[PDB]
C-alpha cells in the first residue's frame, strides 16, 4: 500500500493539527532540544488565538509525562521558557494559573536507565524556570528588552 | 436503573468501537495471555484500512502504560507479533516509525508489590521482538512461507 506519509498518518489518528505538531516535534524523544527557529515560530502562534490554546495545552500533556520521558519534560520547559520571554502575556498569565504543575517538577525521579541521573536536567530547569516566573521584576524587564 | 449491559456504557463513553474492544479484551490486565482466535481476527482486520489505524493506536496507547499494568504492555508485544508475522504489511512499517516506544521497552521496571519482577516478561518480549522486527531477510521469508 502507501507509504511515506505514514509519519503524518499518525497524527491525524489522534487529530493533531500542524501547530500541535510542531510542539510535539519541538518536544520530541531524542535529544537535540528545540530548534532556534521553532522557538520564534511559536512565539508568532502564540498571540495567534487558535495556536495559542492548542500549544498551551500540549506543553502541559508533555509536562506531565512519565519518568521515562525526561526529555518531553526538558525540552517542554525551555519552550515555556520562550514564550513567557518572547511570546504574549499570554503564555505568562497562562502558567500562573496551573502553577502547581511546576512546581510539582521540581522533584523528579529518574536514575533508572542504568544507573545514571537523568531527571536531573529536568528537575534543575523546572526550578530555574518557576525562580524566573513567582518574582514580577525580572519578568516586564527583559519583555521589554526583548520586543 | 439497568444491571449487567452497564459495562458497555463504559466503553461507549470513551467512545470505542468493535475493534478498538476486541484490542482491549485480549490485551487485558489477566494473566492468561491473548487468545490464538483473537489473533487471526485481528490480523485479518489488519487487512481493513478501517479498523487497520483504531489497532495500531490502541496497541501504542497501551504500550506506554504504568508500571502497574505489565500483562497489558505483554500481551500488546506479543500481538504486534502475530501482526507482523501474519497481518498486513502496513502493520510493520507503522512499527519502524513508532521504534522509539519498542526501543524503550527493552528495559522495564516493575518491583511486584508481593516482592517479585516480571518486570523481565516485558523486558524480553520487547528484545525478542525487536530482534525480529530490525531484520530485513527474517520478515519477507516469515510472511510468504505463511501466506
Known sequence: ????????????????????????????????????????????????????????????????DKGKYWRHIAKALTVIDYLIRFGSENCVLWCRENLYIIKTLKEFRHEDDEGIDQGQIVRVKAKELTALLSDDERLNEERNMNI
Request: aromatic fraction near 8%; avoid cysteine; hydrophobic fraction near 35%.
Open 1 to 64: 500500500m502507501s507509504k511515506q506519509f505514514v509519519r503524518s498518518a499518525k497524527n491525524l489518528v489522534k487529530g493533531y493539527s500542524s501547530t500541535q505538531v510542531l510542539v510535539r516535534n519541538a518536544t520530541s524523544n531524542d535529544n537535540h532540544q528545540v530548534s532556534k527557529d521553532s522557538l520564534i515560530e511559536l512565539a508568532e502562534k502564540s498571540y495567534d488565538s487558535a495556536d495559542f490554546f492548542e500549544i498551551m495545552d500540549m506543553l502541559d500533556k508533555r509536562l506531565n
